[PDB]
Amino acid sequence: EGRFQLVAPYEPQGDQPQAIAKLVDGLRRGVKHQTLLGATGTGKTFTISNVIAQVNKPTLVIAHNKTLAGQLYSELKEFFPHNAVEYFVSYYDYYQPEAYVPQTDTYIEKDAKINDEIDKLRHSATSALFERRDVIIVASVSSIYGLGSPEEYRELVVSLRVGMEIERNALLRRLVDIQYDRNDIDFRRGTFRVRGDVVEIFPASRDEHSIRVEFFGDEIERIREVDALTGEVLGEREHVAIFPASHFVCREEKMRLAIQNIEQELEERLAELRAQGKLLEAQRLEQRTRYDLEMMREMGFSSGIENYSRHLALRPPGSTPYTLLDYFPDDFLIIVDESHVTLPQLRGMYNGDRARKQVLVDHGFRLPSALDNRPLTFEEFEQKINQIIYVSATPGPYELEHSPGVVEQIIRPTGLLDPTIDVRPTKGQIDDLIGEIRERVERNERTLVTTLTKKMAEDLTDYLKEAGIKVAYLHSEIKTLERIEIIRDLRLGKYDVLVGINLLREGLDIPEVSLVAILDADKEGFLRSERSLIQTIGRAARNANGHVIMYADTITKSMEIAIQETKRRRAIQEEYNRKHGIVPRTVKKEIR
DNA sequence: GCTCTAGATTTTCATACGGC
DNA sequence: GCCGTATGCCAATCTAGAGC
Ligand SMILES: Nc1ncnc2c1ncn2[C@@H]1O[C@H](COP(=O)(O)OP(=O)(O)O)[C@@H](O)[C@H]1O
Ligand SMILES: [Cl-]
Ligand SMILES: [Cl-]
Ligand SMILES: [Cl-]
Ligand SMILES: [Mg+2]
Ligand SMILES: [Mg+2]
């Protein structure tokens, strides 16, 4: 039980308050699917926060990337400073999955490294849902990939209360059983130790805050929070729950039967493959499957154990995997940030995973039961939904098709206007641009350019430097850390222009940008779709002199729709401005 | 209708080796 | 067997075109 406490220095404004009211009505009435159509710069997060606070439900927000995810997490940390705002993503620094490519007859070995901090946050995410109700989890599609059952997860928690009767070494056993390691020398998270009559435990969800449990004989006299760094106390606890240090827990009891069932599966497919004269394939499967089974009878954990998931959980074949979704209560809520991308990405996750595994199975690398170790299908994602709100400036088909209408939110609280749009011929285009950029330089304004290919962006960048202009390029070859710099440098003014391809769109706040130039606008394709064009136009929406130049010789079906949608925004906006008598001011935003 | 291209994101229960 | 350490740049996915 709990209660969201929204904290903000502003009240809802513009299209916000009607949007808030409509979405909340929808939710109370029981509408499953809804769509917030929020123009860029209208403050959708904040709209959404109001909605969360009014309906008071643990909510999951799915983002399509870790940058955005990061930001939402940070934004919502500030809006809900007394509540459990949490983070859930892949915790792998690098990961390469097991795979076989028939076209090259190449097998690739699994390779992976784990980030400790994300692992921690994931444990802080799952535990949080069992302790309290005022929870928001900002997640990637990592939330449709498999976890161990949450009912098993909950039941293995070690409860610890003042007055409890409990033997010390039993507690130690139990901590061990739930994947805590003893460590006296190096007391980091996922560990415990003893110092006399006190047992120190470092929850799997914590970085800088240990639990210090003081014992009498078999009685816990007191329980205290402790700074990992310093060592001082930081609170007196009556009780505290220690959750497992892993989301999967194998238990010896049932591991035995699991092995029989695997060995039985092995025989049957080996036979099946020989019967078909796939003799090398059976040789493979035999060789590895037995090696893995060896390590499950000597040790507990074998390499790629996850392939034997469904067997080790003793569940029937074709079984749906438990995921984070199941860790929420039944009446939870889901927000889907940038739904037009996140949902396709979501749909796609299973397809890649299944394509990959079907091959490994076909060519004798893994058993058919490997395929039951998977993310959710989109169809299963749908059934797990309780209610949901797709947020996006350019909602895709699925959203529109499943939502009553849209809740629209085009009026920005700062009173800013969707930019004006010129269309110009490709003849002499880059000279046109160079001049047009120089004008912007003179008024301390910045310019974004998009092109269709990485090399065109680099060439253009080199020919821009050539003309005296200060510029850098920006595409996927550049590492995420360096990007933040590049952009920081643009805002600062080290650069006056930035040339990109497809990273100059959703999520990008730069109010120093007064101009956005979309080259080859007529070249139809994913870089110049209805939606892509609209999203790139938005980059100029955070400036009073915001302007967009599409360089083309024709006007495609997409440009048609973009010019109209924008035009329409600019009118409704300018109307509301003329009523309230507002003079648009460019977004004052701190750059460091 | 098949096959290829573009830029860009995400996901995946670490493990092979050696020296006790 | 039990440890601590060195180690990776390798897949298939998405949308929406081009070229035969
Ligand atoms: N009701 C409001 N009054 C004043 N400022 C607001 C309000 N709602 C949001 N803002 C501010 O406007 C800024 C821009 O909104 P933003 O979240 O970038 O829009 P979106 O992310 O939906 O495109 C935010 O940093 C936010 O602090
Ligand atoms: Cl399930
Ligand atoms: Cl060019
Ligand atoms: Cl050029
Ligand atoms: Mg409206
Ligand atoms: Mg945003």
Numbering used by the authors: 2 to 593
Could you pull the original sentences from the published paper?
Within this complex, UvrA acts as the initial damage sensor but hands off the lesion-containing DNA to UvrB and dissociates, leaving UvrB bound to the lesion in a preincision complex, the precise nature of which is not known. Both UvrA and UvrB expend ATP to form the preincision complex, which is believed to require threading of a β-hairpin element on UvrB through the DNA duplex. UvrB presents the lesion-containing strand to UvrC, which catalyzes hydrolysis of the 5th phosphodiester bond 3′ to the lesion and then the 8th phosphodiester bond 5′ to the lesion. UvrB is classified as a member of SF2 helicases on the basis of conserved helicase motifs (I-VI) (Supplementary ).
